[PDB]
Amino acid sequence: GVSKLNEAKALVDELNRKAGEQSVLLKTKQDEADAALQMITVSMQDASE
């Protein structure tokens, strides 16, 4: 019992932070994509013109 207390706490501590990171890096991908889109919008802005 006592040992599994210690496995569990550690298991609970770091997967959550790790997901927290993963979301934080989804901001990175997703918004990098949304930057690439802004680059295109600007190119278009002169292309139709």
Added chain:
Amino acid sequence: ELKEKFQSRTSEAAKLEAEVSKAQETIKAAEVLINQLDREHKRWNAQVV
């Protein structure tokens, strides 16, 4: 170019966004046991001493 960049880029953010939901489900599954274990741990204390 940015067309072919953003495209591949979008396949990243959401496939990562797959893991964070599985991870979140796992965390949700884990929490259930945490709230029962809140009182139990201090019960587990007294036994062994």
